[PDB]
Chains A and B, each alone.
Chain A
């Protein structure tokens, strides 16, 4: 149940709530007050998903789907069968996510390490809350949120996108995609670099971080370094999600027309607004 070097780290302390009440492990899992909390929220949430399944008349995972209240209900409560279950489950999901993050904070305190991990996770929580809470409340109805279903939630993405024409034209959406793409590029490189140094040509000795920097300078004339690339990966990732939340928070609120039309501000600038020729003239 313990890794060979684990015992010396399992000492008391670090908890944020309940002192030593929940300060223990179950197998490899650390519990803590928030471990108990997420179990509660998760169990309750799964139960309500099952109940929702019977009301729908199907136990098929690819068909189950909990929808939010219809627009008519605005931002108020709704009958379980018509959006109420979705509202409670959403409360549970949020409760489980936040509890999971605080549990990580306790694990950090016991291990004496930084809080960068739970901090980064909060950005994911934020993107989720933007879609099921912030945007809907700003738009006036829970109905704008997405449904909890494997394929139904993809339909929502599709319908929501096309509601504004080709969503590709959302400028914040463009920034976000760039970070997602760049992050994957960077992750592939980091993974490849460290491995090519630790696993050089057969028979040769392990390369050094010096060879890692040399390799990239030879290739593109610059090397960000071992500390910098971990900083970069953290930034590209958090930025991708930050701009994702941003491109949706402005859609349907400050801008509700076709996203492609937004680009007319640039083309209609006084100066070239009339110069004949080109594509727009």
Chain B
């Protein structure tokens, strides 16, 4: 009967959908590799999808995936076992080397642009009209690390112009230089800004940006990776 026909054909439809969906989700990270970086023998039952190309706005070119995957950076790690499946230990300083929870990806060294072609993120001092409209203003507050020591003071807020949102706090260090701290990793209090992921002595290590009025996607990743990595590596001080 019709009902039986409808339900059987639905399961066939659903099977094609799962197939489509799974291959679509293989546009990044594939093919699989062995721990040494060579192509793994078994890639699974699903084949790689045919390449698709994105036309990036503002003349930034195109992106085609799947495509040549490459870390484009040295990885300071070494095996801990003679077989597959075990952790790889940091050969140097995991924070400085950018491995583990402190990893960063080699994204384009350009800033993200808004719908009009302007830098999406700008320090507030350079953003006409922007002001703190609610909640405690962090500008001027001392910054404390997980070791309960003061590492600096907030001198500005970097904001997302098109989304009117605070993304980073610019902090001035003892030596007069500044660093950016992800808004999501700080706790703004009445008389201070608390940073649980880093100890005062690690702030100097936060990657610096090359221009004082803009951050590139590459710098954002290095900064955020570094700060998140403190949760595990700074622990011996927190």
Chain A residues in the interface with B (C-beta under 8 A): 1-14, 20, 23-27, 109-113, 198, 203-211, 213-214, 225-227
Contact = CB atoms under 8 A, between A and B. Distances in A.
Nearest to B57: A205
Contacts of A2: 32-35, 40
Contact of B102 (A112, A198, A226, A227): A112
Contact of B69 (A5, A109, A226, A227): A5
Main secondary structure on chain B at its contact with chain A? loop
Interface of B: 29-35, 37, 40, 54-57, 69-71, 75, 77, 80-81, 84-90, 94, 98-103, 105, 113-116, 162-163, 165, 228-229, 231-232
Main secondary structure on chain A at its contact with chain B? loop
Nearest to B94: A11
Given A5-B29, A112-B102, A25 B35 contact: no
7 contacts: A5-B105, A6-B29, A11-B77, A24-B87, A112-B232, A208-B115, A210-B116
Nearest to B58: A205
B55 A113 contact: no
B87 A206 contact: no
Contacts of B30: 3-4
Q: Which of B33, B54, B84, B100 has the most CB of A within 10 A?
A: B100
Contacts of B33: 1-4
A211 B55 contact: no
Contacts of B85: 1, 24-27
B32 A109 contact: no
A112 B32 contact: no
A208 B163 contact: no
A27 B44 CA distance: 12
Contacts of A3: 29-30, 32-33
Given A206-B54, A206-B55, A8 B100 contact: yes
Contacts of B116: 210
A23 B35 contact: no
Given A110-B101, A208-B114, A10 B69 contact: no
